[PDB]
């Protein structure tokens, strides 16, 4: 089906120490494939997925130099922002960046991203048209002017529609055994009696890949959106995922409820009722 | 601004000697680059640096090392100079907008099997034709530097003790007369009545870059050091 | 792959005529190109960028248009002037997959020559008075369209034509110099055969 590549960068200022902490990771869909950490001993890009290991020494030298420069940039970005917003130096601050591309089922470019947040709030982002920037405040407008003068969107488009996509296909075909697989959810239901008149029902979804899944509860065919308890989809640790959803149900009224699972791995959407 | 400086501006080296070209840059740029210029090869990158204390190999790193002791300074190092390394070297710098690089003035390096051939120019001043003077009311003084090896020379003109630019045309590149002899020539043209002045003192100046004090020289002849050599003549009736 | 191909060698253009220097390239990813200029004995510096809309980034001065379909980025001008004489580099900027670097061409030397309105071709002889019999020959005030010959014998030497400018008033003067150590062979025959 559809696939995506993403890189995530986090840099955090450390007033109690000299250097900021910088962390970078790469994902293909929901599988991490590389990392870099400014405090690691190696000071190199490291592989995190079996199938990125078949890449040559030329790939590793290149990704390492590019990431170290990403690192230096974001170290300096910290200073620049602390300047823009007139903040002192004693307090820790976080810059986050993300960029990457998506491809359709035909493996052709669909969309691309390049966005930042500062201290958790959106700062600037590439727009869907891939030629414009969104800047939320006046500080970000300063960044937007620098970038327009240096034609960054046009250079980014070049990367997003060429390099990002080409690499993604390359990864998809080497990690075919991992990345192009489909694992359907293993599903079951559990009952718990909170008290004399009420009871929680949980709809379990296990061992599935990729992470996208949909769990909805129904009462008499109707969507029970509010009253449904939904946990964050969570990694099992072996490249599969787990999710559940629960509803507080009146004692003896259990069998009027239905759980509905949706997943790419699933030939037909399943409908679970308690027995 | 964005001003990069390089030193030395010129260097004469022996094969197997250690050479260090220096760069300095006060533009608050994190990015620096070293290039070399040749004929039918243009500008080829040798080494670069994106931050203080790290260096990366460029397109042609072989025979060269690099050092970035600080943001300002970036050294190119030849450990064992070879004839292949005779060229003009450029240092450049940029910020993140890295396709806009600001270049240093450049350094001419020549590498030689032996220092023996290094020799300062013989400067000759040639006086105008009476026929040119009569038929056109003008005078072309010609200056001719011959017999010099490495071609690290600059040629200026001096009339009445002050250096002049107007009415002057030097050769852009020195001409090779033998494997170890170069020549460079230039014109000075002024009006008849100007040359006809028994006060109008003239001179051709050639700056020659040669060896430095560090270089060893046999007891026989004089050391072909960095020096100026002039010829001079006054106007006549 | 990821290269630049320029017009090979020396280009000679008469002042006031249109400049046209060729750049073609090969690029894996979306192309970004730049022209650099080096004046004689000067630092190379940035002349122009391939950005802009479509393929036209500058009018009276130098300009260039990127045509992605034939991979061309030709440097152009409407009217060459003597001060345009220099070495021009075409550069490809690679910053998509590899770490930001410029890939330069071999450069093209541009030599713009004067349109000499009234030529007065003459060869003189000139004398080194400090030397005993060392003479010289100067050829000057000739038309830019003529060819100066190259020396065919040892001991004798002839320069490439040069342009000299007297502040007096537009005294553009094409000039060539020749000399030797050959016993006795005169200026009346040396500057022969365009």
């Amino acid at each position: 089906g559809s696939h995506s590549m993403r890189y995530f960068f986090t840099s955090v200022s450390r007033p109690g120490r000299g250097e900021p902490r910088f962390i970078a990771v790469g994902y293909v869909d929901d599988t991490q494939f590389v990392r870099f950490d400014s405090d690691a001993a190696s000071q190199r890009m490291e592989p995190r997925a079996p199938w990125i290991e078949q890449e040559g020494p030329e790939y590793w030298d290149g990704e390492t130099r590019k990431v170290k420069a990403h690192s230096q940039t974001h170290r300096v970005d910290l200073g620049t922002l602390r300047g823009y917003y007139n903040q002192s130096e004693a307090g820790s601050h976080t810059v986050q960046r993300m960029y990457g591309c998506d491809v359709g089922s035909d493996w052709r470019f669909l969309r691309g991203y390049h966005q930042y947040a500062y201290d958790g709030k959106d700062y600037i982002a590439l727009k869907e048209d891939l030629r414009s920037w969104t800047a939320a405040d006046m500080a970000a407008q300063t960044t937007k002017h620098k970038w327009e003068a240096a034609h960054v969107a046009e250079q980014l488009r070049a990367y997003l529609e060429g390099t990002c996509v080409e690499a993604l296909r390359r990864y998809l075909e080497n990690g075919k055994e991992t990345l192009q697989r489909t694992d359907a959810p293993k599903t079951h239901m559990t009952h718990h009696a909170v008290s004399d008149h009420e009871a929680t029902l949980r709809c379990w979804a296990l061992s599935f890949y990729p992470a996208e899944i949909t769990l909805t509860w129904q009462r008499d065919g109707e969507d029970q959106t509010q009253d449904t308890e939904l946990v964050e989809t969570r990694p099992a640790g072996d490249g599969t995922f787990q999710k559940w959803a629960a509803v507080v149900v009146p004692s003896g009224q259990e069998q009027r409820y239905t759980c509905h699972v949706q997943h790419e791995g699933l030939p037909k959407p399943l409908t679970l009722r308690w027995e | 601004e964005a001003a990069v400086t390089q030193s030395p501006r010129s260097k004469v080296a022996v094969t197997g000697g250690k050479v260090t070209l220096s760069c300095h840059q006060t533009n608050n740029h994190d990015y620096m680059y070293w290039y070399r210029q040749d004929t039918g090869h243009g500008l080829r990158l040798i080494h670069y640096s994106y931050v203080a204390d790290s260096t990366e190999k460029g397109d042609i790193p072989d025979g060269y090392k690099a050092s970035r002791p600080s943001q300002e300074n970036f050294s190119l190092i030849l450990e064992l100079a070879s004839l292949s390394q005779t060229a003009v070297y450029f240092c450049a710098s940029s910020d993140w907008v890295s396709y806009e690089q600001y270049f240093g003035p450049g350094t001419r390096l020549t590498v030689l099997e032996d220092l023996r051939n290094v020799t300062p120019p013989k400067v000759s001043l040639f006086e105008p034709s009476k026929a040119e003077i009569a038929n056109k009311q003008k005078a072309t003084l010609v200056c001719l530097a011959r017999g010099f090896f490495p071609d690290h020379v600059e040629l200026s003109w001096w009339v009445n003790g002050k250096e002049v630019h107007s009415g002057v045309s030097t050769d852009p590149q020195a001409y090779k007369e033998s494997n170890y002899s170069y020549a460079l020539s230039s014109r000075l043209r002024v009006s008849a009545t100007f040359w006809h002045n028994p006060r109008n003192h003239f001179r051709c100046q050639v700056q020659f870059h040669g060896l430095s004090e560090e270089d060893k020289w046999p007891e026989g002849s004089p050391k072909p050091v960095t020096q100026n050599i002039s010829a001079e003549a006054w106007g006549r009736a | 792959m990821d290269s630049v191909t320029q017009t090979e060698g020396l280009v000679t253009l008469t002042e006031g005529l249109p400049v046209m220097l060729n750049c073609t390239y090969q690029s894996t990813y979306s192309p970004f190109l730049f022209w650099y200029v080096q004046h004689l004995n000067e630092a190379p510096k940035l002349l122009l960028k391939s950005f802009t809309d479509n393929k036209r980034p500058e009018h009276q001065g130098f300009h260039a248009t990127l045509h992605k379909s034939s991979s061309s980025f030709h440097l152009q001008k409407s009217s060459a002037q003597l001060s345009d004489s220099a070495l021009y580099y075409c550069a490809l900027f690679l910053a998509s997959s590899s770490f930001s670097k410029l890939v330069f061409g071999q450069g093209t030397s541009l030599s713009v020559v004067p349109n000499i309105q009234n030529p007065e071709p003459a060869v003189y002889q000139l004398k080194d008075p400090r030397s005993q019999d060392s003479t010289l020959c100067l050829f000057t005030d000739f038309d830019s369209q003529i060819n100066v010959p190259k020396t065919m014998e040892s001991g004798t030497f002839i320069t490439d034509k040069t342009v000299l400018d007297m502040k007096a008033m537009d005294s553009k003067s094409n000039g060539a110099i020749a000399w030797s150590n050959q016993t006795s062979f005169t200026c009346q025959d040396i500057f022969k055969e365009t």
Binding site: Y7, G26, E63, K66, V67, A69, H70, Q72, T73, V76, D77, T80, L81, V95, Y99, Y116, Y123, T143, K146, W147, A150, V152, Q155, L156, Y159, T163, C164, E166, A167 | D95, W96, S98 | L94, A95, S96, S97, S98, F99, S100
Partner: peptide, 9 residues
């Protein structure tokens, strides 16, 4: 494959 152009804020 990371990007090789490094814009600043």
């Amino acid at each position: 494959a990371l990007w090789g152009f490094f814009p600043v804020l």
